[PDB]
């Protein structure tokens, strides 16, 4: 989810 989604991958780099 999030780490398709430019607002959680630049958010949550970590994960992606």
């Known amino acids: 989810g999030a ?3 430019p ?3 630049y958010d949550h ?3 992606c």
Do not use: T
């Open 7 to 9: 607002r959680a991958n």
């Open 13 to 15: 780099p970590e994960i």
């Open 3 to 5: 780490c398709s989604d």
